[PDB]
Amino acid sequence: DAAGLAISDRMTAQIKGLTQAQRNANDGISLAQTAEGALGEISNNLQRIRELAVQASNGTNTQTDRDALQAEVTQLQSEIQRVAEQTSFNGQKLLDGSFNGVQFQIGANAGETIGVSKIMNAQTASLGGSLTRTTSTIDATDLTKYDTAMAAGDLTINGVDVGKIDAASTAQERAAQLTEAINRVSSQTNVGASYDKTTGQVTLTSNAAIAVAGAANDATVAGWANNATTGTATTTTGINSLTVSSFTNAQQTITQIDNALKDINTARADLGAVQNRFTSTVANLQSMTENLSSAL
Asked: What are the residue boundaries of the Flagellin N-terminal domain, all occurrences included (predicted)?
């Protein structure tokens, strides 16, 4: 009768709806699995940076040694950035900070959904969270008196003499010299230098104000003029500014990479949780579809 036809139609709608819900849940599971897997790949690269930072921290390294290690870190940072910006499921970016929570239709009716929560920005500018330190940056080209020789005592960092520095033949050479001289005593002074040859900038990093003193007192010669509290309190995010160019930088890198690994772990915990929910839902959907097919 008419009532029986309506019941059959209801059961048909439910069977078709729940069957599609199962396919929907598979797609949702697959998206979460994609994100979790890619986060693991980032973790693998983070591990490599961390290891290099442990190596770079050792007091037997030359600047040339640390530069070689930093070259590897730069490549690993670009690889992390690549995974973060490229990782997608069916055209939808997952790890670049644009995935802020989408619903997955896992029932026959409207509103019957499971949400995959916001996935954190895994890009190098964000991954690892906040980083607070004192920094001071100069342009290598500011070293217009690169050809002035530096005697011992001309430049001191936190009371420590960086020693004699030969007259250079370019501003860029003097930038490299100052970086090397400052970094020799980085583990004593807790101040580290990094010379980025792409940007042409030398950056000092420390946990506190940097005491710059000495006989030179000329930024065009020694990069920094005398100033007992040199530097700006800087708070940025991510791992993109991390280097292993100095003891101080490498130490900072170990800590911040650990923060990044922590962020990965928390992100995977959330994705693992939603995978469990999808799996539980699939089981219930299969049971509901089988019982409803038996009713016929």
From this structure: 1-99
